[PDB]
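Internal ticket - ligand job 1027, magnesium ion:
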Amino acid sequence: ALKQVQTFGKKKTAIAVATVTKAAQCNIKVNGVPLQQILPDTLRAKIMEAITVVGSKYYSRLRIDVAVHGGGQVSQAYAARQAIAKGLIAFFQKYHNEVEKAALKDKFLAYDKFLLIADPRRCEPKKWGRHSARTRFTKSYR
Amino acid sequence: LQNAVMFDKETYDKLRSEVPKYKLITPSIISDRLKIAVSIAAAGLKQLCREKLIRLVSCSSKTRVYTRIV
Amino acid sequence: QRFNYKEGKLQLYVERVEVRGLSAMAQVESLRFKLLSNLQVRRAAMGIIRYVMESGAKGCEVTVGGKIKGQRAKSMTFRDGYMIKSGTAHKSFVDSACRHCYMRAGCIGVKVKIMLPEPLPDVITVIEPK
Amino acid sequence: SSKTPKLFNKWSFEGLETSELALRDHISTTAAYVPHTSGRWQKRRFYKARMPIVERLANGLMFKGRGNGRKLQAARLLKHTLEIIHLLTDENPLQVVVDAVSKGAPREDSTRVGRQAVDVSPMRRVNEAIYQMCKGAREAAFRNLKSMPECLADEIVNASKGSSNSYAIKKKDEVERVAKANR
Amino acid sequence: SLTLIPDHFQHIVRLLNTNVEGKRKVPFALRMVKGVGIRFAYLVCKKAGIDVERRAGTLTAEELEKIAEIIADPAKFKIPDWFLNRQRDPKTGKTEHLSSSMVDTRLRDDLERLKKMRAHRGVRHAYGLRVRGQH
Amino acid sequence: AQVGLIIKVLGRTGSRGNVTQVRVRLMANRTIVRNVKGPCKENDMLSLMEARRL
Amino acid sequence: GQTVRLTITSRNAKAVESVTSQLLTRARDEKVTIHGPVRLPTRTLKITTRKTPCGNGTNTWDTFELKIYKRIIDLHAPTEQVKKITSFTMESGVDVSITILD
Amino acid sequence: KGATLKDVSAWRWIKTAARHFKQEGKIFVPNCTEIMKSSHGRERAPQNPDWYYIRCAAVLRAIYLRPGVGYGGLSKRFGNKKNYGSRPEHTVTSSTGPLHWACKSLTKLGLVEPGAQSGQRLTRKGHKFADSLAFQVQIR
Amino acid sequence: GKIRTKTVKRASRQVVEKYYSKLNFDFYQNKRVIMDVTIAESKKLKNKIAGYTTHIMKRLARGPVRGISLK
RNA sequence: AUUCGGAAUUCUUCUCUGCGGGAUUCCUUUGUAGCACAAGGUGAAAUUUUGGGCAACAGCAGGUCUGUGAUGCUCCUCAAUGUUCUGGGCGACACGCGCACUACAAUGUCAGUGAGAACAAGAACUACUUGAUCAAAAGAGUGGGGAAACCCCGGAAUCACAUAGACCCACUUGGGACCGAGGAUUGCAAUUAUUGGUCGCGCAACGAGGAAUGUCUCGUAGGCGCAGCUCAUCAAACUGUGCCGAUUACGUCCCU
Ligand SMILES: [K+]
Ligand SMILES: [Mg+2]
Ligand SMILES: [Mg+2]
Ligand SMILES: [Mg+2]
Ligand SMILES: [Mg+2]
Ligand code: NA
Ligand code: NA
Ligand code: NA
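stdout (structure tokens):
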């Protein structure tokens, strides 16, 4: 019937939520903007990796809408490519076999671990007597 | 050092007869071969592209790389 | 009067402390009483330690410092039993107090630390089977 | 319907190889789409021998206070650099780049253990070849009319041929000569 | 702009008793005059009907007379009073624009006037000190 | 410049410990002891254009 | 009929959870529909100041923090029913405010 | 077959709309636009001879995306970092003077109307204009 | 961590003697057994106790262990 | 088919949080001569998981009597070293020293256009919208709204642009010190500029810095802005928060 799934992915503070649906024609948009209007062309090649790695024939009749908040210019391009990659796996688990899903999942991991697993690195707090997380005040003797 | 700011008769025909025979054409490269500013060297190259005498290869907001038409 | 409470809206009751040998607030005031009287400092500090240890304490410590004898300041501590000093749980298993006693010359400051006997953070017991 | 990635959708990674046997296992030629990735490459001791060679170049252009942390700008500078290399050499730009890091560092060095001539570890030859070439181009474009893509392309193209008109080849010839005297 | 050198290209041009380079753009060659800045030199180019994409040194004397007349008195041309450097002159009360050698000579009058009446800014100027409360 | 293969890491010599002592097997089977500058591990490969053991 | 909103706020975490857990049981005895409770975000109050009283030696600071806890429960019952639900001896530190929703 | 806004390049819509305003010759341009800095955080004048038309097309697109936006909201969108001399830089919002004139010019064209109790929003005519222009750029 | 302390090693030996017939070589079942037969306020400590108790049981399966008297 | 903003149903993937779970050298192998180590596996996390807090016993003639209604002993005590009021100073100098901010440009400056955080604070002062506007900015003035409900779909700056824009290697559209003339705002009071905005000056050094020298091992250095505190007005400082994001080593006892 509806054939709907919802996933998510985070990089530093960006939280991107996807929504994969069964429709008539392939359509992927990020925050409203289509995929081919994303700039710079470098960050658009990172998001398109979640498609070229497995092939576009597995996105044949899927419609994906990603809504990203938090983070910055590059955090949001990495959170959005996780939600798209995790979304394809979640849709195949709910409506296909395990043989088909297992082949997809290994291809994503054989290319990049962080296509399905979140990066746990976060900002380190600042401490008094220091200008940063680890840089102390300048010392003078005479 | 001392680069001209407008084309004269002898520099203009060199731009329209010798530049189209260079493997690599850039505003900076043509500037030191004709002794003109990079501001008017870039304008002369945009003219040659419009009439289709050189081929664009890499285009950006601040960088442009040309070459021979064939 | 200070807080402008309306009449019939404020009430106070007084309840009695269970055991006076386990409150350093009361013990330090017994110590000051001896000190403001003609009492030997060592004989004064030995009374507090023996009392609280007899009353059922788990570790005690008394510190008296400042112009005890002569024109030079000095510190005299008296420890007995076990007492933790580090960590966060030390704020629940230890009680403390302080006071400033006005001598004829100078000032004297005395502290009393009492270890009140949730289990300790790093003790493990194994239940006897059967 | 997958396909092997090409750098900037144009340059092919197929057939990339090193003619230097010693350095074969320390230059990485795994295919990628852009010089940008977010991986923890400094977690183990020998993890930077797997990071792709072109990404290491882009990391060497982010120097000084002006250049610190500008990785997207460094990718754009490399995009134009490979275009100029193709016109100057008429070869695959990726084959020229790995021919430069295999010829830009001294094979013998002298140190203060006693100075004494000392051989150089293969991981040091790769690290120093990238560092010397990025530094030679950055200083040759300071107060010059040339832009940096044209300076960097001249550095890499000259280093791949072993020409003495390269900054990295000049330092390699001096260091190797000095170490031989201390042998 | 692929326009050939005119036979009358003037590498040095004279304006308001000031030498002006004949290789810069028009707004940035008029900034060489005293009293005309970058922001003021764009307004002068609009009021004189001169394209700002030409090199100074291609313009003729008729263009230079119009330029030197706008700068001399910017009132007839609708340049607002909030745009002139000397408004409500303290000794005459008339708004004007000071340019060329008159910028220096009137600055000399400002210092000589403060010193004559023994004001605090006068004595500090006479002793070659700082006057705006800098330590 | 013949090639050699590192077969064992003897130890870290030098006052400040920036030079390693290794035994190489000439792949051009002779085991020669040499000094090496920079990070190195077993099964590496130097390009040789002896030394006293640590 | 009407909707009444109860706000619980205190400086101690255990006291807040004890009172709210009491109100739910009392409310269910009166057979009253319940919307909640909701755990609102806790605000943290911070003050940082120098340790030395004379300004000497190394510059050392300490940070003092306070936490404030907040819960809300929406009931469906007239005033008299609510007047009986909340009439108990809550421990010190906790306050409960009655609001009639529109 | 058809197209709407947000399906086309943001600039190519603004460049096309600014040409429409200039060629029709109906929009109202204030006289202060020839002598003014776009903000007090700038250093020099806008230096593009058609800079009022570019902002009006940029302001209209902003109202389309976020209905109910006011002059203070648009100034956040057109702010910049100011050069303070030998002191650290800071962020200054744009001046709401020129934004007040830009919403007046669009209102007289009928493309913008005052909102419901707050802000400005575009009318039905403005909706047809915005989307019709988006189809024109798409078909090149 | 790396190296275990006296608190862990002493307590983990009383467990072996009292409850020797409820333990085996699997860490996860042993931890469930231990959490019911001991008192402590920190789950980190109970993890290490079950870690060392598993280590002892492997040694007992080979030969005698010093300081452990099953009797 | 795709977009935008009335009525409805349902429902927790994301957000909120009081108590819980989870990691233990757990598993395999090597060097092996019980304690352990290295590589790999499992995994969100693999070694004190990461970053902090608390921290023994002894001592310094270390600082503070300018915090305190903590004090010994001293001093002055009625035109007084008490207390209040007025004015000035703590801000004075072509001298020396510590710590910062801005630069010396093209990996740039200027003019546009795009996408897009987190921690906080607010009278119970913070802030929106609309006038002013038939014509600079800063301002003034009117209606309203508040504490996960208002500000707020928190429109930060680095950043990006196929923007078919300007400049072209020069103390120059780099740099912005010093100074002049209008005008507005805080305050009882701006003359030693309180601060902000407009035009002008830029002919003030500065083109990468001698001997010496500080800090630093991964979301770290460096770069970039934002809140709080001081506060009627003023942050080149401090205390926090997020954004972009590397080079080198994973060693030794040479210097300390
Ligand atoms: K500046
Ligand atoms: Mg200091
Ligand atoms: Mg700065
Ligand atoms: Mg830049
Ligand atoms: Mg201070
Ligand atoms: Na600057
Ligand atoms: Na002393
Ligand atoms: Na040092």
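Auto-summary: Residues 10-24 of chain H form the longest helix (15 residues). Chain H is about 45% helix and 10% strand.
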